[PDB]
Amino acid sequence: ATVSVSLKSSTNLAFTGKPTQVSLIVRVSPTSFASLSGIHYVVMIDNSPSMKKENKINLALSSASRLVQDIIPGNFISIYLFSNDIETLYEGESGKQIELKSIKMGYTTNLHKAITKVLEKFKSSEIPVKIILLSDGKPTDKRYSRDYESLQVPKNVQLITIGLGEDYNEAIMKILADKGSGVFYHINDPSQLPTTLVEQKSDKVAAYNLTLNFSEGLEVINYEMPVNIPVVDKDVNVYAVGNIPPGETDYTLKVTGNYVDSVSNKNIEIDESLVIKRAPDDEVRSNFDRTVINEVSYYMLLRYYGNLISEGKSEEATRVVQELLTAAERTKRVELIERTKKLVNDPKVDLSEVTKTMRTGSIEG
Amino acid sequence: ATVSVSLKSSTNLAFTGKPTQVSLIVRVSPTSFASLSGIHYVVMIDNSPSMKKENKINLALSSASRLVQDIIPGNFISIYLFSNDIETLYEGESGKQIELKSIKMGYTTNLHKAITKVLEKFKSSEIPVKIILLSDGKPTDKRYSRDYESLQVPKNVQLITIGLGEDYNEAIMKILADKGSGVFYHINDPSQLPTTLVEQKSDKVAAYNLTLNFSEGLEVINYEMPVNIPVVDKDVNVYAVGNIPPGETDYTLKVTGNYVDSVSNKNIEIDESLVIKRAPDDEVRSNFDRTVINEVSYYMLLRYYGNLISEGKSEEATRVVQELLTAAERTKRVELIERTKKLVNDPKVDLSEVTKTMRTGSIEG
Numbered sequence: 172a173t174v175s176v177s178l179k180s181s182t183n184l185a186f187t188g189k190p191t192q193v194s195l196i197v198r199v200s201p202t203s204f205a206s207l208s209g210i211h212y213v214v215m216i217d218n219s220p221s222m223k224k225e226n227k228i229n230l231a232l233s234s235a236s237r238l239v240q241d242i243i244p245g246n247f248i249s250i251y252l253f254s255n256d257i258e259t260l261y262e263g264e265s266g267k268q269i270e271l272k273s274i275k276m277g278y279t280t281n282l283h284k285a286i287t288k289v290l291e292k293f294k295s296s297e298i299p300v301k302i303i304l305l306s307d308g309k310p311t312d313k314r315y316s317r318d319y320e321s322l323q324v325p326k327n328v329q330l331i332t333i334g335l336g337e338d339y340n341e342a343i344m345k346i347l348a349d350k351g352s353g354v355f356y357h358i359n360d361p362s363q364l365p366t367t368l369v370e371q372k373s374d375k376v377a378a379y380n381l382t383l384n385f386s387e388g389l390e391v392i393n394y395e396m397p398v399n400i401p402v403v404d405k406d407v408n409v410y411a412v413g414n415i416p417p418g419e420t421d422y423t424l425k426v427t428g429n430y431v432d433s434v435s436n437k438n439i440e441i442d443e444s445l446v447i448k449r450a451p452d453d454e455v456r457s458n459f460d461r462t463v464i465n466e467v468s469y470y471m472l473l474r475y476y477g478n479l480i481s482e483g484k485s486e487e488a489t490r491v492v493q494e495l496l497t498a499a500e501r502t503k504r505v506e507l508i509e510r511t512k513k514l515v516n517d518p519k520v521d522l523s524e525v526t527k528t529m530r531t532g533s534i535e536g
Numbered sequence: 537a538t539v540s541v542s543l544k545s546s547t548n549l550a551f552t553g554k555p556t557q558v559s560l561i562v563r564v565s566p567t568s569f570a571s572l573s574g575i576h577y578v579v580m581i582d583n584s585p586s587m588k589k590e591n592k593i594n595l596a597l598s599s600a601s602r603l604v605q606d607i608i609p610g611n612f613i614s615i616y617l618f619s620n621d622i623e624t625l626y627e628g629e630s631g632k633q634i635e636l637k638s639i640k641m642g643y644t645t646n647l648h649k650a651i652t653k654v655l656e657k658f659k660s661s662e663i664p665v666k667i668i669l670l671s672d673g674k675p676t677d678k679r680y681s682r683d684y685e686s687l688q689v690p691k692n693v694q695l696i697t698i699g700l701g702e703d704y705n706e707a708i709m710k711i712l713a714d715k716g717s718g719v720f721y722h723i724n725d726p727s728q729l730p731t732t733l734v735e736q737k738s739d740k741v742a743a744y745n746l747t748l749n750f751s752e753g754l755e756v757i758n759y760e761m762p763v764n765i766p767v768v769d770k771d772v773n774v775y776a777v778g779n780i781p782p783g784e785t786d787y788t789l790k791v792t793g794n795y796v797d798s799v800s801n802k803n804i805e806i807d808e809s810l811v812i813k814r815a816p817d818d819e820v821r822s823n824f825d826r827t828v829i830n831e832v833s834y835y836m837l838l839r840y841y842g843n844l845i846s847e848g849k850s851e852e853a854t855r856v857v858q859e860l861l862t863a864a865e866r867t868k869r870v871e872l873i874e875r876t877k878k879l880v881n882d883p884k885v886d887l888s889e890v891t892k893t894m895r896t897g898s899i900e901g
């Protein structure tokens with residue numbers, strides 16, 4: 172096995188006369204690694220007129236060419252430009268030296284059309300796919316984040332977004348990252364673009380096409396459900412909150428799924444469970460692990476905060492930031508405290524940091 | 537307005553140092569009606585060799601012809617047969633006298649292919665659609681209910697299933713009904729088929745294309761989310777359980793959406809909300825409305841029961857039946873007690889009754 176999937180629950184017991192709240196932390200920990208093989212990267216680059224400004228398009232294309240070069244052989248990569256429609260600059264093996272040159276295209280930024288078309292290419296595909304989408308401006312087709320809530324991201328596709336400068340729609344870049352279980356990188360300055368893009372490569376991986384299905388009544392907070400991640404190259408941390416029905420029957424919480432072992436190439440089953448038993452009320456109350464509840468609450472608060480910021484509710488958002496700080500300190504977790512302090516009420520920065528904190532396993536550095 | 541949307545919560549308050557459970561009942565009550573207009577019925581009829589037996593196909597087709605006749609003018613209806621593939625017998629206006637004759641087709645029952653193809657016809661469509669699917673046998677393409685969990689039912693499509701006899705896969709007929717916010721009718725005997733099919737018509741309706749979106753952290757138990765129902769002709773009852781994050785900020789639960797008023801044809805916004813405030817723990821505890829919690833718990837238990845039955849876990853299922861009885865009596869609700877007593881541990885009967893009890897607003901009589 173190349174990963175270990177662990178379950179940590181706030182309770183082993185449930186009330187008998189009313190529903191019981193449960194907080195769950197699931198971690199997928201890579202335990203051994205192999206060279207990346209058989210996956211497909213897609214880089215989608217805005218080719219609107221704004222990107223022509225100040226060599227942005229050139230910075231983006233030279234960086235895309237580097238990524239093509241640097242991804243180890245044995246994988247596949249497509250490079251698309253989009254404006255009015257999508258155009259293919261390269262589709263072929265990784266590890267090649269190629270010159271990507273810009274081409275003339277139409278006006279407009281039909282982002283929804285572009286991402287829809289690319290997602291459709293991978294419907295029902297077994298190939299692990301990472302899509303990286305870069306833009307410096309607002310879409311002109313579907314202009315609001317709510318327009319993207321219906322997007323259907325196929326199994327085994329991840330979507331990562333990079334927003335450049337101050338003029339793009341961060342709510343849209345966030346929801347895309349959320350729907351695709353990726354990260355939304357805000358980068359104020361084009362000087363950071365090459366590193367952000369080239370760092371998206373992975374040389375070593377533990378698992379492909381990981382799926383985690385949760386039993387009924389359990390709601391994952393930080394990833395779309397079912398949890399599906401095409402490439403596991405570092406810890407994947409999943410936080411959920413749920414509700415257990417009353418009565419006297421034992422109730423089994425289940426996390427089930429599968430993944431492809433990167434060393435053997437075998438498809439391995441995931442089956443982790445916890446049996447919740449029943450007890451008198453005072454015994455149930457005394458058994459709750461408040462440290463688990465507090466850690467999960469942080470992510471509930473963070474989700475709320477992300478939504479406030481995306482909705483422009485700035486004062487309430489700052490109040491919640493104060494609470495996130497309190498909640499993070501309550502956990503005594505250090506990564507988390509530092510991450511929380513990066514929330515500076517700049518909505519581009521904040522929504523990007525929300526995705527990074529929610530899905531650390533999706534970050535590439 | 538032709539409907540009234542009401543919210544009933546188990547709490548007005550939330551704890552400040554930990555998450556709070558909330559049970560919510562949302563009802564959409566029709567308040568005035570108009571003649572059904574502008575919708576599209578689809579009847580899909582299994583045309584495998586088993587259906588040729590004992591005039592089943594003939595009973596089904598004569599009944600489909602009656603439904604074509606009886607649906608009032610101003611609507612549209614498609615009649616498909618499926619086995620190896622789908623074939624169209626009729627596509628046209630309602631209110632017509634047509635003879636539907638069987639035709640020779642291939643062997644096999646490619647149910648997943650058939651439903652996929654029909655659903656695709658209505659991707660991105662604004663037309664309210666009711667699909668009624670009849671079968672007397674097991675699919676031969678995708679043979680397990682888990683194979684249907686990924687089905688994408690478009691907005692404004694409802695899927696109703698009718699299982700005939702003892703040889704079809706009830707778990708599949710159930711999941712299809714669940715994914716399409718419909719009802720799964722088990723009918724042991726072909727003599728009941730004509731009534732079950734013809735009764736699917738509605739003469740009078742209050743709303744079309746109703747959508748209910750729930751704010752973060754709220755999980756609807758008895759319908760797929762977002763809740764979307766193409767035709768409202770009787771009360772729609774929605775039960776949800778959720779979890780509120782800690783802290784001191786007011787937290788607004790929201791049910792938002794829209795529908796088309798059947799009298800004016802205008803598209804009307806739904807916006808219902810409840811502000812949850814904070815209080816000391818003892819005050820929060822004292823404020824919970826246990827009658828709301830108990831009623832929602834019934835549906836949590838019923839969902840669990842449905843899953844046990846679909847998984848063949850028969851002893852545990854009978855234990856849960858006993859608890860459902862207790863839970864239903866705890867509510868003192870009469871419809872509910874009688875419905876619970878119809879659960880007889882025959883899995884075809886039981887899974888059908890689960891869908892009927894979950895979605896009474898989807899039942900047609």
Ligand SMILES: [Cl-]
Pocket residue numbers: 266267268
């Ligand atoms: Cl080369």
Ligand SMILES: [Cl-]
Pocket residue numbers: none
């Ligand atoms: Cl207490």
Ligand SMILES: [Cl-]
Pocket residue numbers: 631632633
């Ligand atoms: Cl006629």
Ligand SMILES: [Cl-]
Pocket residue numbers: none
């Ligand atoms: Cl107490």
Ligand code: NA
Pocket residue numbers: 337517518519520
């Ligand atoms: Na900014």
Ligand code: NA
Pocket residue numbers: 702882883884885
């Ligand atoms: Na039976």
